[PDB]
Amino acid sequence: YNKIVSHLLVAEPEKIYAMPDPTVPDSDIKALTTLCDLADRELVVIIGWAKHIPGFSTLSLADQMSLLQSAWMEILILGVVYRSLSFEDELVYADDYIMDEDQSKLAGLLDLNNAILQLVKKYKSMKLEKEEFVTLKAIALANSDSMHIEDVEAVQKLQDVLHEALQDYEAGQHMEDPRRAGKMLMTLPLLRQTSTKAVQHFYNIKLEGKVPMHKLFLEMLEAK
Amino acid sequence: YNKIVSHLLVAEPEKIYAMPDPTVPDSDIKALTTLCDLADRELVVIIGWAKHIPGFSTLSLADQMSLLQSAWMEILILGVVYRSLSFEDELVYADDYIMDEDQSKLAGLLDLNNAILQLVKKYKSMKLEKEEFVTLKAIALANSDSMHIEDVEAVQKLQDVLHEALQDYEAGQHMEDPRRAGKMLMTLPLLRQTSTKAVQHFYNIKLEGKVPMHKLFLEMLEAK
Ligand SMILES: Oc1ccc(C(c2ccc(O)cc2)C(Cl)(Cl)Cl)cc1
Ligand SMILES: Oc1ccc(C(c2ccc(O)cc2)C(Cl)(Cl)Cl)cc1
C-alpha cells in the first residue's frame, strides 16, 4: 500500500516503560508524578519521530515547534488509546502502568480517563489498524491549529500530503467502505476535545505545585 | 447536485435579530445578556431545523435531545462564523450586533472571539460555500460524541448519510480538489475546541450569577 503509511510504520518508536517508584507509597501524587514523568520521556521520542514525517524537517524551527506545542497532548493521548484497544475499561499508559477505574478515581482522573475510554470504544468498533493509527498521529500534528504559523501554505501542504496518504490507504485496503477515510477524520474532534480538557486539568495540577514536572513537559504545558 | 445538500439549503432558518436594549448603558453585562438572549432564541430555531435532517426525527426523543445537548454550541458558533465570512476581524452575531476587537475586550470575550476568528480565517481561505456550511452544521450535530446515545447504530447511520452527502457534493462540484471533503472534515476539530472553551466560559458566567439567562439556554448549558 501507500508508501507514506509504510514509512510511518517503520518510524514508529519503541515502547517506553513507566517505572513507577516501588519504594513510594501509592497515592494520587505518585500516580500523577509517574504519568507526567512518562509523558516527559515520550515527548522526547515524539520530537525525534516527527523528523521522519515527509516535509516536517524542512519547516522553519519555529513552525516545527509551533506544531509540536499545539499537538503534543493529542499525540500522547492517541498513543494510550491505541495501546488500550485490546483491553476492557483499562488504559495502557505503558506495559507496566495500566489504569483501571479504581486507580483513575484515586488519581482524580475518572472524568478525563472516561473520555479517553470513549475514544477507545469508538476505535474498537471501527477496528482501528496500526497503519491508520500512525497516519492519524501525523495528521493530528499537521492539523493542530497553532495560531503562530509562519508558513501557512507549507503547513497546509503537509496536511495535504498526509491526508492523501490516508485517502489512498483506505481506497486500496478498505474498498468495502468508501467512506472509511472520512470516518477516521471524524474521530479527530473527540481527540481534540479530550486533549483540551487534559491540558486544562494538568495546568491546574501545575499551579497547585504538589506534583513535580520536568522541563520539557513544563515547556509544552506552559505553551498551551 | 446532492439532494440532501439542496434539502438542507431550503431548510435553512431565516435570520434573527439581537435587539440589544437601547435604553441600557453599554457594559459587559449588557453584551453578555444580549448574546445569551440571542442564543436562547437561536436554540429554539435549531431544534425546529433539526427535524428536517433525514432520519433525525425517527431517533428516540432521548437520542434527539442527547445530540442537541452535545452539539448546540458548535452549531451556534458555525452560524456566527458563516455570517462573518465577508467581514474583517468582526463577528456578525446578527445584522444588528457585530462585534469588533474593542467590544470583545469590553465583554471579556477577546480570547474566545479570537479563536472564532481563527475559524473564520480558515473558512475564508477555503472559500466555504453555503452548501458546505449547512452540511457541516448537520454533520456537527450527528458527530457530537454524546456519551448517552441509546441507538448507536442509528446515530452512526445518520453520520454516514450526511458524510456521503458532503462527499458527493464535493465530487461533483469541486473536481479540481479531490481532497476538499476531507479538508472540510478537518476543520471540525477547531470547531469542537472553540465550543469546548465557550461552554466553559459561559458556565463560569452562569455561576457568577450576574448575567440573566433563559430556560432553554440554561438547560443546554447545564447539560454540557
Ligand atoms: O488521565 C490522563 C493521564 C495522563 C495523561 C497524559 C498522558 C497521556 C499519554 C501518555 O502516554 C502519558 C501521559 C498527560 Cl500528558 Cl496529561 Cl500526563 C492524560 C490523561
Ligand atoms: O464570544 C462568544 C459570544 C457568544 C457565544 C455564543 C453564541 C454563539 C452564537 C450565537 O449565534 C450567539 C451566541 C454563546 Cl451561545 Cl456562548 Cl452566548 C460564543 C462566543
Swiss-Prot record, chains A, B:
Its UniProt miscellaneous note says:
No physiological activating ligand is known for this orphan receptor, but 4-hydroxytamoxifen and diethylstilbestrol act as inverse agonists and deactivate ESRRG.
**Disulfide bond sites:** none
Encoding gene (name): ESRRG
Q: What is this protein called?
A: Estrogen-related receptor gamma
Which protein family is it in?
Belongs to the nuclear hormone receptor family. NR3 subfamily.
Tissue specificity statement from the Swiss-Prot or TrEMBL entry: Expressed in the heart, kidney, brain, lung, bone marrow, adrenal gland, trachea, spinal cord and thyroid gland.
Provide the protein's localization. Nucleus
Residue runs in coiled coils: none
Tell me the function of this protein.
Answer: Orphan receptor that acts as a transcription activator in the absence of bound ligand. Binds specifically to an estrogen response element and activates reporter genes controlled by estrogen response elements. Induces the expression of PERM1 in the skeletal muscle.
Source domain of life: Eukaryota
Kindly state the subunit structure of this protein. Homodimer. Binds TLE1, PNRC1 and PNRC2. Binds GRIP1. Interacts with NRIP1, NCOA1 and NCOR2.
* TM regions (residue ranges): none
Post-translational modification here is noted as:
Acetylated by PCAF/KAT2 (in vitro).
Q: Which residues are in the NR LBD domain? A: 1-224
Which species?
Homo sapiens
